[PDB]
């Protein structure tokens, strides 16, 4: 037995061969089915993730996120949030990897990049939620934060809503000026617009900023359209929020993971008894979302390991079909299982 | 920037090139200094490890063990305890891998086997504790459980104590019959002996069994020598213990990691208020330990991530000097840090 390693090249070849649109659709579909299964009590939310805070060069966190399928395998995503990475090192803020372990023996069976996978399932989760809670004829998307996740937020939302334009803001002038180029393939025209104008004019918004703890909101408490749906995606440190309390208190709020959202999502600002049903419940039983497209709604997105397990499965199906990746004997399997030194 | 991967064959080369005694002594030395640094407040205990219980084919657990060296690197060991692995699959009960991430950026920098590393530092930890708490003239080691850990228990303790004799027991006759061959390189004469004889004659004992939850003790509460030191090494599920409560309550008890020992060690049987200074404190000031050499002592060992990070450092230093291992591009670093689709 050896570990199946998908290098960055293998992951790139999956997306090149399959195409960004079709790959994202597959992940949207697998996420939707998986969330409904949880909502039906056929599956269960992943346990709370954990992490280590890191204060230099700016405050960030490094986290571990397990999800078990009993009798089959265990998925562990390890992922760092390091918001100085782009400017200081030319690295993504979000840097991670995803491993699979056999549930029967414990052996490490697969390992792959977590960077692209994270952006895909995070965009996909917003798409699942916005399909349920945004007006089906939504045409104007607002984006606060135009970094890495904003790319897959726009892309995924453009596959489930008839988007015609994106109004976008970033506190970094260079980051918002470059977004149009990064977004061009979607065919959604991009216009830079200040947060107050985004609040007023957007049918759907995604916030996905590296705003520091305590420096929210990134979207002002002002007039919004009556049917606005917000995907609140920014999430890292306890104490980090993006939306103003007044808007949140007027919202129908659905969390992807209620216990996690109360700790790390917008739901930090909310009493636990004001939470709407979680996203999985919306997917299994749409009675909970019926009519909420026409009033203010917020999808409190923190991300959880089941989403990574599902997106990894999409990647491994394509990789197995194309015989991609390499086999590396990493674990030491001694000829004598009771002799750690039988380096066999 | 690619990930440095040490395969099973590179780990074997490290052992063959360094030698078993030298490699064990390097890990003992590194662990003693590291623990003292914790004892002096220059470093900190790793956080609580997390785990997922599995019930098939027999009860086991899969765990994640993170440790942070601020400004340098984060270590994570992922390790399974699957006690049916030897008989059913010819795999070790303990199966795992150790990953290293840059603490500044989050990047995955190194990945290696954790099977041998785990056995090495677990024996080294018992050696550190037993040098502190056993009589310096201890000649008879007892071993309850003669699987994988027993091999490095005997090896490491034979480097710090003048062992003339090892009296060993295992509930599986083939496992106790094979132990002398697995132990031959240590030079210490092995005798099979039932638990009551081991209790009566041993100067030092390590218990390291796969006993099931609630099926202890593995050593009888009977006549023990007055100066007996016990390394309680077996640890996996909540509810698993190896020592008789009456013995534990008479002993001076030091845990490697108090909150983990409270949940998973022999200290499950004790009140929180009844433990001694932890091992790190005894390394910083052996005075607290010298006075316990001539009385009944128990080192409650659960293993914690710092030991894995230290032993990994030893392996990486030896592997670098011999230019071992491969380099794999696993993490996706897009040419544009804000564009997850900029594959390269
Ligand atoms: N919910 C999930 O599942 C999930 C998944 C991945 C990442 N995230 C989180 O999403 C957030 C964004 O991640 P990313 O990879 O896009 O990071 P990124 O660094 O690529 O982009 C963040 C952008 O936000 C901008 N920004 C910072 N403060 C701002 C403010 N007050 N207003 C507007 N813009 C601001 C930065 O200039 C930067 O361009 C992070 O908190 C990350 O941890 C969430
Ligand atoms: N404390 C630490 O740092 C640390 C590190 C590694 C492993 N461990 C733990 O140590 C234990 C042993 O692991 P291993 O790798 O040697 O497993 P292994 O399966 O190689 O050996 C366990 C042995 O114990 C024997 N055994 C089971 N019940 C017994 C009993 N009642 N009396 C005597 N012998 C019995 C089995 O026959 C087997 O030979 C496990 O619980 C493991 O989780 C602890
Ligand atoms: N903090 C960044 C990690 C992100 N929340 C995720 O679910 O992957
Ligand atoms: N629970 C088995 C794992 C072992 N205690 C370790 O520290 O690696
Ligand atoms: Na959030
Ligand atoms: Na123990």
Automatic annotation (TrEMBL), chains A, B:
Binding residues annotated for NAD(+), in chain numbering: 93, 121, 148-149, 170, 175, 210, 233, 235-236, 240, 301
Entry's EC annotation: 4.3.1.12
Source domain of life: Bacteria
Assigned keywords, A-Z: Lyase, Nucleotide-binding
Keyword Nucleotide-binding belongs to the record: yes
Protein name: Lysine cyclodeaminase
Encoding gene (name): pipA
One CC-aspect GO term: cytoplasm
Record bears the keyword Lyase: yes
PANTHER family: KETIMINE REDUCTASE MU-CRYSTALLIN (PTHR13812)
Enzymatic class: lyase
Single GO term (MF): ornithine cyclodeaminase activity
InterPro entries per the UniProt record, alphabetical: NAD(P)-bd_dom_sf, ODC_Mu_crystall, ODC_N
């Amino acid at each position: 037995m050896e570990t199946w390693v998908l290098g960055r090249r293998d992951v790139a070849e999956v997306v090149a061969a399959v195409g960004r649109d079709e790959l994202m659709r597959r992940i949207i579909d697998r996420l939707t089915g998986g969330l409904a299964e949880i909502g039906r009590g056929e599956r269960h939310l992943s346990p709370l993730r954990g992490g280590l805070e890191r204060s230099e060069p700016v405050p960030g966190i490094w986290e571990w996120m397990p999800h078990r399928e009993p009798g089959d395998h265990i998925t562990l995503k390890t992922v760092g949030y390091s918001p100085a990475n782009p400017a200081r090192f030319g690295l993504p803020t979000i840097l991670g990897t995803v491993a699979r372990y056999d549930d029967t023996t414990g052996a490490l069976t697969a390992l792959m990049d977590g960077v692209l996978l994270t952006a895909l399932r995070t965009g996909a989760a917003s798409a699942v939620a916005s399909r349920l809670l945004a007006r089906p004829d939504s045409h104007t998307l607002g984006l606060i934060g135009t970094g890495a996740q904003a790319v897959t937020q726009l892309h995924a939302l453009s596959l489930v809503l008839p988007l015609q334009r994106a109004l976008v803001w970033d506190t970094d002038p260079a980051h918002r000026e470059s977004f149009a180029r990064r977004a061009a393939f979607t065919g959604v025209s991009v216009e830079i617009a200040e947060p107050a104008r985004i609040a007023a004019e957007a049918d759907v918004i995604s916030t996905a900023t590296s705003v520091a703890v305590g420096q929210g909101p990134v979207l002002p408490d002002t007039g919004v359209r009556e049917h606005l749906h917000i995907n609140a995606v920014g999430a890292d440190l306890v104490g980090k929020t993006e939306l103003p309390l007044g808007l949140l208190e007027r919202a129908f709020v659905t969390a992807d993971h209620p216990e996690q959202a109360l700790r790390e999502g917008e739901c930090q600002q909310l009493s636990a008894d004001r939470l709407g049903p979680q996203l999985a419940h919306l997917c299994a039983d749409p009675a909970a979302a019926a009519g909420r497209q026409d009033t203010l709604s917020v999808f409190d997105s923190t991300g959880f390991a089941f989403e990574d397990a599902l997106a990894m499965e999409v990647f491994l199906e394509a990789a197995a079909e194309r015989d991609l990746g390499i086999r590396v004997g990493i674990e030491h399997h001694p000829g004598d299982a009771l002799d750690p030194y039988a380096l066999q």
